Design a binder for this molecule. Structure first.
Ligand SMILES: *[C@@H]1O[C@H](CO)[C@@H](O[C@@H]2O[C@H](CO)[C@@H](O)[C@H](O)[C@H]2NC(C)=O)[C@H](O)[C@H]1NC(C)=O
Ligand SMILES: [Ca+2]
Ligand SMILES: [Ca+2]
Length: 275
C-alpha cells in the first residue's frame, strides 16, 4: 500500500464552473478560465491509517473530540444529520463504532482545521478550490464528472454515491453503503481516486457564490468569509436530492464543522519527504 502517494498535476488552463449550473444557489456559474501552475495532489483521500500516523506523531486531538460530538447520518446509526455525542474519527457512528475493520477508508469527522494540521504536518497543504476542481476534471473539458458525462459509463460504477430512495434505503448497488477504501473505483485521467463521491473534501478557499468571468492565475478565492469550501460529494449523494458529485459542484461548512461524510486530501507545490 502507498496511500500517501501523490501524482503530478500538469500546468494548464481550464474552465472552472459552468454556464449550465445544476444548483444555481451554489454559484456554479459563471464558467471562467483559470490558469493553474504544475503541482502535486494526493492520489487518495487521507485514510484512517494515514491520519493515525499523524496523531501518533503529534498527539493531535481533533475538534470533534474536544467538542464531544459530531454529525452522523441517521441511516447508519437536515433531519437525517444528528449531532452524536462521542462520534469522531475513531468512532464514526458514535462511541460503540470503530475503525479497526476499515483502516483504508477515508478519515471522517475532520474539520477544516484538523485537515490543515494534517496536511502541514505531512509537508503539504490543502488544495485551493480551483486546484481541486482542475484535478477533479482529469484533463477533460466541460464534463459533469471526472470521467465524462455518463454516470455509469460502460455500465460500470465509477464513484461511491447513493443508490435507492434517499435517505430511507441505500441499496449498496455500487458495492458500498458507507465509505469505500480510498483506492476503490477507477482513477481519473490524472491518477486520482474517489475525487467525486466517497468522502466530501475540504479545500483552502473561503466560500463565496459571487464570481467574475475574468481570467485568473492560481486563484485563492475571496480574502474573507465565514465558511470554507468543500468539493466532490460523497457516498450520500443522489441525483434526486443532492446532486453534488460533479467537479463543478460546491458546498460549504464553518471551519470547525465535522461530519461522517466529510474528509480531505492534500496537495503540495513540491514533493515532500516521506517514509
Ligand atoms: C499508532 O500507535 C499505536 C500505538 O503504538 C500502534 O499500535 C501498536 O503498534 C505496536 C508496534 O507495531 C504493536 O506491537 C502494538 O500491538 C500496537 N498496539 C496497539 C495499542 O494497537 C499503531 O500501529 C500506530 N498506527 C499507525 C498507523 O502507525
Ligand atoms: Ca454507495
Ligand atoms: Ca471524495
Amino acid at each position: 500500500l502507498a496511500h500517501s502517494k501523490m501524482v503530478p498535476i500538469p500546468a494548464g488552463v481550464f474552465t472552472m464552473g459552468t454556464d449550465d449550473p445544476q444548483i444555481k444557489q451554489d454559484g456554479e456559474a459563471p464558467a471562467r478560465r483559470v490558469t493553474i501552475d504544475a503541482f502535486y495532489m494526493d492520489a487518495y483521500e487521507v485514510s484512517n491509517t494515514e491520519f493515525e500516523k499523524f496523531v501518533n506523531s503529534t498527539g493531535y486531538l481533533t475538534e470533534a473530540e474536544k467538542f464531544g460530538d459530531s454529525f452522523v447520518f441517521e441511516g447508519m446509526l437536515a433531519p437525517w444529520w444528528l449531532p452524536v455525542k462521542g462520534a469522531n474519527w475513531r468512532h464514526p457512528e458514535g462511541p460503540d463504532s470503530t475503525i479497526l475493520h476499515r483502516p483504508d477508508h477515508p478519515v471522517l469527522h475532520v474539520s477544516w482545521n484538523d485537515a490543515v494540521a494534517y496536511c502541514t504536518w505531512a509537508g503539504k497543504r490543502l488544495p485551493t478550490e480551483a486546484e481541486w476542481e482542475y484535478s477533479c476534471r482529469g484533463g477533460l473539458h466541460n464534463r459533469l464528472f471526472p470521467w465524462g458525462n455518463k454516470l455509469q459509463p460502460k455500465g460500470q460504477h465509477y464513484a461511491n454515491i447513493w443508490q435507492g430512495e434517499f435517505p430511507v434505503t441505500n441499496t449498496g448497488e455500487d458495492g458500498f453503503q458507507g465509505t469505500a477504501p480510498v483506492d476503490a473505483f477507477p482513477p481519473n485521467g490524472y491518477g486520482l481516486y474517489n475525487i467525486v463521491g466517497n468522502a466530501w473534501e475540504w479545500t483552502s478557499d473561503w466560500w463565496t457564490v459571487h464570481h467574475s468571468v475574468e481570467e485568473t492565475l492560481n486563484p485563492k478565492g475571496p480574502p474573507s468569509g465565514k465558511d470554507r469550501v468543500k468539493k466532490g460529494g460523497s457516498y450520500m449523494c443522489h441525483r434526486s436530492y443532492c446532486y453534488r458529485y460533479r467537479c463543478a459542484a460546491r458546498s460549504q461548512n464553518t471551519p470547525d464543522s465535522s461530519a461522517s461524510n466529510l474528509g480531505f486530501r492534500c496537495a503540495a507545490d513540491r514533493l515532500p519527504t516521506m517514509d
